Design an enzyme around this catalytic site. Structure first.
Site, PDB file in Angstrom:
ATOM      1  N   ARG A  24       0.816  -1.222   0.000  1.00  0.00           N
ATOM      2  CA  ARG A  24       0.000   0.000   0.000  1.00  0.00           C
ATOM      3  C   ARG A  24       0.851   1.274   0.000  1.00  0.00           C
ATOM      4  N   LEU A  66       6.894   2.024  10.305  1.00  0.00           N
ATOM      5  CA  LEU A  66       7.662   2.463  11.497  1.00  0.00           C
ATOM      6  C   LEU A  66       8.878   1.592  11.826  1.00  0.00           C
ATOM      7  N   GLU A 113       0.954  15.138   4.131  1.00  0.00           N
ATOM      8  CA  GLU A 113       2.089  16.036   4.265  1.00  0.00           C
ATOM      9  C   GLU A 113       2.908  16.142   2.976  1.00  0.00           C
ATOM     10  OE1 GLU A 113       3.105  16.246   8.954  1.00  0.00           O
ATOM     11  OE2 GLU A 113       3.264  14.245   8.062  1.00  0.00           O
ATOM     12  N   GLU A 133      -1.867  10.478  13.281  1.00  0.00           N
ATOM     13  CA  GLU A 133      -0.738  10.440  14.218  1.00  0.00           C
ATOM     14  C   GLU A 133      -1.167  10.531  15.679  1.00  0.00           C
ATOM     15  OE1 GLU A 133      -0.846  12.261  11.351  1.00  0.00           O
ATOM     16  OE2 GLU A 133       1.102  12.278  10.322  1.00  0.00           O
ATOM     17  N   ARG A 136      -2.236   7.495  17.339  1.00  0.00           N
ATOM     18  CA  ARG A 136      -1.226   6.471  17.524  1.00  0.00           C
ATOM     19  C   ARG A 136      -0.199   6.869  18.588  1.00  0.00           C
ATOM     20  NH1 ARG A 136      -0.494   5.360  11.045  1.00  0.00           N
ATOM     21  NH2 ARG A 136      -2.108   3.753  10.774  1.00  0.00           N
TER      22      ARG A 136
END
Lengths: 259, 259, 257
Positions: A24, A66, A113, A133, A136
């Site tokens: 993805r 991450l 962003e 964000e 999380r």
């Protein structure tokens, strides 16, 4: 060449496709670094006048992988190789030439962003957006905090940044993040057509437009103002100004050379 | 008086029409200097409380008269005469009192920048707009690089500035440049009606709104904040503050005197 | 009750009603000081993650009761432990404020909405920046925030004229985030406040703090903090609980550290 990007050229226009569709288009260490390189290459290639960034497969990007960069962000390490440029352009350096971003499907976190870092954003009708964000345990650290309030207004930006709620293409367009919404699958071709229009204009004028606009934001109104006439004087000096003014007076079409 | 401007007074409102019919109201040295003088004269005339600017004939303006001016921009000369103010207000000086711009037909290059320099913009339904400077080998040097991104957002501004594409009143209104769209031919009359509303308000209060707002843009939030209360305290001292109080209590319209 | 405010807690969400309906919720010295104290208390109460401000009775606020404060302005109206609700004295809230408006929103009311982070209007809300109509000018921040949010032209159309505009226009120009049916403004604001209260509080606070830094100090100032701030957040219990929820498909219960 690149493992995670699909790159093509259409004359003066560079077309870069995020290409990890099975994942993805999540940004792992490799795609972070490759996109940085590709955009750095773009910056120094004088044959290129515009660039279009889109994603292959079902959606633009699922955001950050991450684990891939655990690791770097914890230690404050840079994911900009020599001579790349941070694609989010929040380390003190920005692109000298135009970037367009074409989005579809989910645009999460860093994807929002990326679009805010570019100059023109085109969405197909399926595009949705979510600044996840704070959901999380972290916050937006790719420039949304700076650019989203500036483009959308403070309230419109905070409605989405503080809640992590999903918003759609119509809302993204209402509040100024998306310049145009097109039918399903047409976002990349619409963005390239616009890129080609940009590429028919005088490159040093395009560059001056971006440069002075950025100076205004970074240093203020007086700083940009002070450059206005000196910059036009320098451009009147270029081959392209004589080409452009003669074309106008002659009611003909100018072919600019970028000097 | 002026060769290239048609000027009328409707009580407290100055009305200025661009008028170079053979050249589509394009700005040459003469009209630049005359507009500069007429606005400098507006600035010092305490009997004037608002100014409306429009174009005679079939369009607002075709923009810069390449040369005429070209040669004189190549050599560095200032086109702001003694007593004048740069109508685009990009040399570090701005009008102390309101300017409204009424547009119709073609609004090219400097015309978009005049609208952006003003305080309120009214378009009739026929108005279209093109930031053509990059199509002529130069770039927008009348403040669009500063003001268009601030008004429309970066992406919306760059879609038009980088491409030189034509956009219509509907788009211009969507993105914040045009405050109201009115039926064909009604732009000047609507702009004057709004100017007359302004001229009914307290002139020192109107001036203070402009001044504090500009300070915020030029020096930052803190600089503006610092002046908020000292400024209102100075206004409470005025004749008009007591006139305004008496009208509040009587539920009537004050006849302010501007002191 | 205070006297001029009705205050209640809805879990993590503080709900403040302006409560002088017989005086059209005009801000007199007392309500100015009570609102300053309540917001000051919001600021230091770590059990509150969002606040909602609305008006009791027919309208949001008729503006300033000048008589009540005339001596002071012609002196600070922020008491010890208080914060200026309009947040124009060099200090701003660290945590979110939502404003829910209906009926008339005059003068300082527009400016409260502008000082907030999210504004919800019901369909009846109308707005008027009347200050220039009364011999003065807007002095609670509209001169700064209205042009930044709406654009210069859209702001000056209303600030220079004192003309009344409606919810649809306030929404068009960015001041109002959503218009809802008559009387649903507080409930909607509270629903959004609760969504905020489910997110990581240090993340919410970081978002506000960095966005404010960009405005007050500039892009470079905000940029420089981006990675140091995310690094600190990655060290928080809530970052761990956030990672635990993602990888285990569950919803996190954040604790604000």
């Amino acid at each position: 060449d690149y493992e995670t990007l699909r790159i093509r050229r259409d004359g003066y226009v560079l077309v870069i496709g995020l290409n990890r569709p099975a994942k993805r288009n999540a940004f792992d260490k490799t795609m972070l670094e490759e996109l940085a390189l590709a955009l750095g290459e773009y910056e120094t290639d004088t044959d290129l006048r515009a660039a279009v960034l889109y994603g292959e497969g079902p959606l633009f990007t699922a955001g950050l992988d991450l684990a891939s960069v655990a690791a770097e962000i914890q230690g404050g390490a840079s994911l900009t190789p020599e001579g790349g440029i941070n694609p989010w352009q929040v380390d003190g350096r920005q692109l000298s030439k135009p970037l367009l971003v074409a989005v579809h499907g989910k645009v999460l976190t860093l994807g929002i962003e990326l679009a805010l870092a570019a100059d023109i954003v085109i969405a197909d009708e399926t595009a949705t957006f979510a600044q996840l964000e704070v959901n999380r345990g972290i916050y937006p650290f790719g420039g949304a905090t700076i650019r989203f309030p500036r483009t959308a207004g403070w309230g419109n930006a905070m409605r989405w940044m503080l809640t992590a709620d999903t918003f759609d293409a119509v809302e993204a367009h209402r509040i100024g993040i998306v310049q145009e919404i097109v039918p399903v699958g047409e976002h990349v071709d619409t963005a390239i057509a616009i890129a080609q229009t940009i590429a028919r204009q005088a490159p040093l004028g395009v560059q001056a437009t971006l440069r002075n606009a950025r100076l205004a934001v970074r240093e203020g109104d007086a700083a940009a103002e002070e450059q206005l006439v000196p910059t036009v004087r320098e451009l009147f000096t270029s081959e392209d100004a004589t080409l452009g003014v003669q074309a106008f007076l002659s009611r003909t079409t100018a072919e600019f050379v970028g000097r």
